[PDB]
Amino acid sequence: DTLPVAAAFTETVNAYFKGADPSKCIVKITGEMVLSFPAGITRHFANNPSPAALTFRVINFSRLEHVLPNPQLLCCDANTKEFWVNMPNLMTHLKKVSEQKPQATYYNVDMLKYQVSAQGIQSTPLNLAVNWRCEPSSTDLRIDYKYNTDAMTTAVALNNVQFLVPIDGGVTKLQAVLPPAVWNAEQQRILWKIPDISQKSENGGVGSLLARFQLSEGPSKPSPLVVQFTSEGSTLSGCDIELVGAGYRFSLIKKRFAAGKYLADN
Amino acid sequence: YDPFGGDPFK
Ligand SMILES: [Zn+2]
Ligand SMILES: [Zn+2]
Ligand SMILES: [Zn+2]
Ligand SMILES: [Zn+2]
Ligand SMILES: [Zn+2]
Ligand SMILES: [Zn+2]
């Protein structure tokens, strides 16, 4: 029989924006490549103590710096890299987890940890630019965002996007909010939630968040906007995976990315 | 964290 196997690329994009100046944008993208095996394998490997070699290739591998291969399972060319998995250590590992997690239907294993070479604001899926105008008893906030297709290999939506920003100065009331937000009085912060941002969004993916605050113990000190969002269907790196040799097929290759530490200063 | 958010095999 030929064994089903699964694969996931999961990337975190960290970004820091400074006012409206793109040159001052610091970006850092990291990722994990994970393989997954179905329970059956244990039995399967019991059948055969000399199984078919698990060998794969990463495509667009040159887009990665700082690559750490799983020390127990790997590592010992230009734009592709090939790997031969250590089968005795994998069989061992998978036996151990199966014995401790007997009701598990599948087992994930970390294969590769890496960085993705990122070139400034171009590598960033949600361009951001914040401006504060802080008056003694007043405060105006503006956030400008632009969905950026260039950052990702295939054009995919950004989901569950959150814009959180703390507001100093002793806020007493907010006016002129657009689109609607939520005020958290206890933490003294404002939160905008947008369910989806894509090319097929209300405005092409490009829009503004506005707010005005009245103060009693002003003026307020500008604070970092923190952003959250996830995404399924595409990498930032452009990596894919191929199986080389016989004995296994990919049942599924999951690609996805997410905001990690994603901020905007004044 | 599970990148498959469930069973990828069925
Ligand atoms: Zn079998
Ligand atoms: Zn090679
Ligand atoms: Zn182990
Ligand atoms: Zn992991
Ligand atoms: Zn690194
Ligand atoms: Zn949705």
Side-chain angles (χ1 to χ4, degrees), chain A residues 8-66:
Chain A
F9 292 88
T10 307
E11 298 166 358
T12 312
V13 59
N14 314 269
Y16 162 101
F17 300 88
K18 222 304 167 191
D21 181 344
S23 75
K24 288 196 175 322
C25 188
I26 295 171
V27 175
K28 188 205 182 87
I29 303 161
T30 68
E32 277 192 355
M33 202 284 273
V34 170
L35 293 176
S36 193
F37 304 86
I41 57 96
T42 39
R43 298 189 163 190
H44 184 227
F45 284 151
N47 240 263
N48 218 331
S50 188
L54 210 195
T55 35
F56 59 100
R57 71 176 85 243
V58 189
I59 275 88
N60 286 327
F61 189 74
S62 64
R63 302 209 196 183
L64 318 183
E65 35 189 28
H66 290 52

Side-chain angles (χ1 to χ4, degrees), chain A residues 4 36-38 105-106 108 251 256, chain B residues 1-9:
Chain A
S36 193
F37 304 86
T105 146
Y106 64 106
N108 290 338
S251 73
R256 64 172 59 174
Chain B
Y1 162 78
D2 187 338
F4 299 95
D7 210 322
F9 293 102

Side-chain angles (χ1 to χ4, degrees), chain A residues 44-168:
Chain A
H44 184 227
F45 284 151
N47 240 263
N48 218 331
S50 188
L54 210 195
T55 35
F56 59 100
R57 71 176 85 243
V58 189
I59 275 88
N60 286 327
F61 189 74
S62 64
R63 302 209 196 183
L64 318 183
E65 35 189 28
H66 290 52
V67 178
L68 294 156
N70 191 287
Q72 181 81 352
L73 312 172
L74 307 166
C75 183
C76 256
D77 300 321
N79 198 47
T80 271
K81 200 191 199 306
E82 299 177 31
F83 300 94
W84 190 342
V85 182
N86 192 309
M87 308 295 316
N89 297 345
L90 175 70
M91 295 186 306
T92 298
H93 180 71
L94 287 174
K95 272 196 54 175
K96 211 167 312 287
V97 301
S98 78
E99 293 165 340
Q100 198 66 2
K101 267 310 300 169
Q103 304 297 299
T105 146
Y106 64 106
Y107 313 103
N108 290 338
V109 41
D110 288 348
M111 288 285 180
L112 250 14
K113 296 163 186 288
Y114 58 78
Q115 253 216 25
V116 178
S117 290
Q119 201 56 279
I121 197 179
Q122 225 175 8
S123 295
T124 244
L126 223 207
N127 288 13
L128 261 27
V130 188
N131 188 48
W132 300 56
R133 161 192 168 255
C134 300
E135 250 91 24
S137 73
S138 193
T139 286
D140 293 70
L141 211 223
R142 191 194 186 103
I143 302 167
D144 283 327
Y145 66 83
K146 160 181 189 295
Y147 168 87
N148 167 36
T149 341
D150 291 333
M152 68 201 80
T153 127
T154 147
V156 152
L158 299 181
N159 313 118
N160 300 313
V161 340
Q162 296 179 29
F163 302 81
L164 200 274
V165 24
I167 315 288
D168 212 35

